[model samples]
Target: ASKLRAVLEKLKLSRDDISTAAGMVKGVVDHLLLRLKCDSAFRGVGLLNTGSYYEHVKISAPNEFDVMFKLEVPRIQLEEYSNTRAYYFVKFKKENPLSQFLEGEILSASKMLSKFRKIIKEEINDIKDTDVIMKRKRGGSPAVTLLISEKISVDITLALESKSSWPASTQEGLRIQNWLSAKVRKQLRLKPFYLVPKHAKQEETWRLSFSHIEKEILNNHGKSKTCCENKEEKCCRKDCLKLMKYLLEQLKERFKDKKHLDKFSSYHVKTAFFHVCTQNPQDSQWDRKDLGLCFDNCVTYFLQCLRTEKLENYFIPEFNLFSSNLIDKRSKEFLTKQIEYERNNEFPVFD
Candidate 1:
C-alpha cells in the first residue's frame, strides 16, 4: 500500500485527485421542456451523477453540444459542483455516491410556471390590462394618484425535458449564443409572473414599490438604436450575475408603486432555486453558487431603491425538487391521458 501511495505521489497525484474528478461528471440529464403561451421554450429536470434525466429536448448530438441554464436544476447543480466538487468523484470513485435535497427548487419553478400558465388560461378571454401596462413608483409621485393594487395567483405542474429532436453543434460553442439565448427567451416568456399576494407575502418584505436596477442609457440624445450587446446562453442560470440583474429589472417594473402588493416595504427574488443547466457537453455535472444573493436580495435592493414607508421587507425562497425522483413516476401515464384527450379519443400511446 505504501509503495502504491509513493507511485501516485511521484506522479504528483493522490488517490483523492482521481476520485474528485469523477464527482464532476454527469451520465444523463433531464429538463422539463414546456411549450407555454410564448415562443418555443424549455426548462429541464436533470439527473446528474445518476446518468438519468427527465428532459424534453429532441437533441441529436450526444457528444458535441450541451444546454445552458442562463433556471433551477442547471444553475444550482453547477454551483454545488464547482467547489472541490471534484472530490465527490475522486474520493468515492463511485460517481458522487450521495443524493441531496433539490426538491424545493424543482417545486418552486414548477409552481411559478404552473401559475403563469393558469393565469394565461384563465385570462384567455379577458387579459388583465396590468399585464400590458406596467407601473413605476418614483418617490412622492402625487401619492400614487391612482392607487390601484390588485392580487393575482398562478400555478403549474412542470413538464419533463424529453429527448429533443434538435441537431447538435459540431464545434465548441457552435450554437453557443443562439442556443442558450433561445432557452432564456423561452423560459422568460413562459416564466411564471403573477400577483399571488398571499403566497408572495411570505418571502417578500417592505410594503414598498419597484424600481429598475440602474439602467444607464448611453446619452439618449438621439433616436439612434441602442445597439445593446450581451453574449447569449439559453438558461437564466448560466450567468448568475446577469440573470439576477435582468430579473430584478423586470420585477422593479412589475411591483412599482406597490400596485400589485400591499403593506410591505419591498419584494424579494427567492433565487434559492438556481439551476445547473449544463455548461459543457464534455462535463454534464451541475454547479451551485451562493453569492449570498437569492430571490431575497432582489427584494432587498428594491426596498432600498424605493424606500417605501408602508411596507416591510421580506423574502420567499424557492424549493428544489430535482435528484430525489420527486417528479411523479406516473407522469408518463398522465401525459398519455392528455394526448388521448387532445386527440379526441385518438390513440396517444407510442410504440
Candidate 2:
C-alpha cells in the first residue's frame, strides 16, 4: 500500500524508537527498585507500641528527614500502548523461572542506565518524602515514607496510588505482587521483611491481608515458639507484623528515659535519636559490601518480605551525602553559636 519502499524503512525506524523507549523505562524502574530495603531488618528499641502506627514507624525522633521509595504497579493497558503489546507480569516462585514481561528482554544494562538516572533524578526533585502509612501526610495523596520501623527499626517505607472512586481488580494483580515479595526475599537472603497493604483513608492501615500469606506461613511453614520479643535486632523479612511492637518500646526508652540521664544531656540524646533513623544514609544493605553482620544490611533484607508493602521502599538520593552534609554543617554552625551565647550568660559550675 506504500507509494514508496522508503515508508517501510520509516516504519522500521519507528519500531526501533519504541524498543529504545521501553528498555529505557524498564531499566530505570529496575534501578530504582535496587535501592530499597525491608522493615524487619533492624535492631534497636523502637517497636514497643506496635499497636499505634507512628510508634512502630519512627524516623529518628520527630524532626529529622530521610528518604523513602514509592512503588506503583498500574495495570498495563497494552492495547493502548503499542510497545507494551506483549508484556508479562506473573507470580513465580523465588526459586523458579520468571517470564520476561516483554517478548524481548533488556540485554544492555549500560545504555538504558543513562536514561534511568535521568528519570530517577527528576522524580526525586518533584516529590517530597512522606509517611502516609501511619502518620498520614498533609494531603490526601497517599505517601510511603521509608525511614525506620519504630518497632523493628529497619529503614523502609510504603506508599499507595489509586485513581478511582470504587477501585476494582481481579486477583491477578495481587498475585504478581506476591511473587515480587518472594523474589525480593530470595535476592537479599537476609533479615526478615514484609509488604503491608495500602489504604486511602487516614483511619485505615495499608497492610497485606494476612489471610492469603498466613495460609502459607502457618501451614506451608513450620511452628515457631521463638519470642516475638527477641532482644537482638533482626532483618524482619518474615516477621514484619509481629516486630513493630518491639521497635516502639526502643524509641520510648531512648527518647524518654535516656533524655533524662544526667551524664548525657537531653540535646545529646536527641541527636542520637536522629542518628538512628539516618542509619547508613548512602548505602542499601544489599549494595554488596562485605561490611559484616552490621545492622544496616539486615534491615534491607527484611524489606524483601514486604516487597509489595509500600508505594516506595528504598530511594537513591539525587545528590550524594555531601549535599546533605553541607546543610548539616551550616546547621551545626548555628547551633554552636547559640550554645556559646548561652554559656556566656550562665555561671561556670564546679562540683
Q: Cα lDDT of all candidates, in order? A: 0.23, 0.26
Off by over 4 Å in 2: 1-73, 76-158, 161-318, 321-328, 332-351
Per lDDT, the best of the predicted structures is 2
Query: What TM-score, over all chains together, does every model reach?
Result: 0.16, 0.19
Q: Candidate 2 residues 272-302, lDDT tens each?
A: 2223223432223212222223322332332
Q: What CA RMSD would you report for each candidate? A: 27.1, 25.4
TM-score of model 2 (CA atoms): 0.19
Model 2 global lDDT (CA atoms, 0 to 1): 0.26
lDDT (10s digit) by residue, model 1, range 300-330: 4333323321111111111111111322324
